[PDB]
RNA sequence: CUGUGCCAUA
């Protein structure tokens, strides 16, 4: 516990306990890994520190490699470490340069381990955010380029490091992570993980020419475009596997749903969805994807999808009554109703596809009518019937 | 007869 010298007869930290007392004693490490003492320290180091208090603080908390790692990997001490790092960055004295270089080197030498650690990942994250960019880019360069990078992308802790890097580091400096991830085997592994798939979405988002990248110069936009194509190529080459997977389906969905990735939406729809609609519609995971394809397909593609269901080598009956498929039919139905009722754009390329939508609606209404008695036996079926009843409202 | 995730420190 906390050094005898620091306590009451009742074993309480003597109020009037000073930062300097702790720094002089050589016992800072004991307080920093204690819940109560750490809170004292964090309050203490936020005060007005003299030049020499900082000297001692810097040396004891971010100046010795082993203590630095011990505190960074500690449940309380990690907070103190981040706090001292910030003070170090706000202290424009002489040793400013040497201090940061050391810190950077301590961290680099243990990058993976610190990234994978519940508490040191927090030190990593705040360092990437707060260090001068040039230094921060050096932490990024310390990332493994082997199997360990996968481990990080899929770790509950370390995935946030990678996400932090995508938020605050220039693309030039992490381009390699993109190409690492677009590796068929890496793409496979990473998109199939509950943390990996968020990570991969976050990269795609950063790589997207949306309204959050309007500040990019033409150069930055070109670099961004190239990286996006490399990743999209890999992703489309495997859309079937990705679209049907329990985690990856969210990525396929994101892409299909995004107008700023229209062209990739279309590749996917053609690559793995088209001519597999009936099959994918009956799948737990890929059925949500099918819904998104119907909801976002350009009208000419939409027509091919509709025809596939109505008169593709019945399909409509299997889906209408399948545990998953039924959501697809409902979605088809809502799409056609909205279209007829002005809620949904029916023009594309200078031509109205209104008659097509009206043909699709006729087919659906006619089927629902004949299958009514049976559809009313089910929740899904009663919803279709209402959707149709609300048209006549 | 209803159908999927992650968003993590005292």
UniProtKB/Swiss-Prot annotation:
Entry GO CC: cytoplasm; nucleus; P granule
Result for mutant: residue 198 to Y: Abolishes binding affinity for both 8 and 9 nt target RNAs. However, plays a major role in increasing binding affinity for 8 nt RNA and retains base recognition specificity at positions 3 to 5
Tissues in which the UniProt entry reports expression: Expressed specifically in the germline (at protein level).
Top-level taxon of origin: Eukaryota
Pumilio repeats: from-to residues: 21-59, 60-98, 105-141, 142-166, 179-218, 234-270, 272-307, 314-347
Residues in PUM-HD domain copies: 1-392
Coiled-coil region(s): none
Locations listed in the record: Cytoplasm; Cytoplasmic granule
GO BP: any one term: post-transcriptional regulation of gene expression
Subunit structure: Interacts (via C-terminus) with gld-3 isoform A in an RNA-independent manner. Interacts with dlc-1, and is required for the localization of fbf-2 to P granules. Interacts (via RNA-binding domain) with lst-1, probably displaces bound auto-inhibitory C-terminal tail and alters its RNA-binding affinity.
Function: RNA-binding protein that binds to the consensus sequence 5'-UGUGCCAUA-3' in mRNA 3'-UTRs. Involved in the control of stem cells and sex determination in the C.elegans hermaphrodite germline. May also play a role in the hermaphrodite germline proliferation and oogenesis. By binding to the 3'-UTR, represses phosphatase lip-1 expression in the distal part of the germline mitotic zone. Binds specifically to the regulatory region of fem-3 3'-UTR and mediates the sperm/oocyte switch. Negatively regulates gld-3 expression possibly by directly binding to two sites within the gld-3 isoform b 3'-UTR.
Name under which the protein is recorded: Fem-3 mRNA-binding factor 2
Gene designation per UniProt: fbf-2
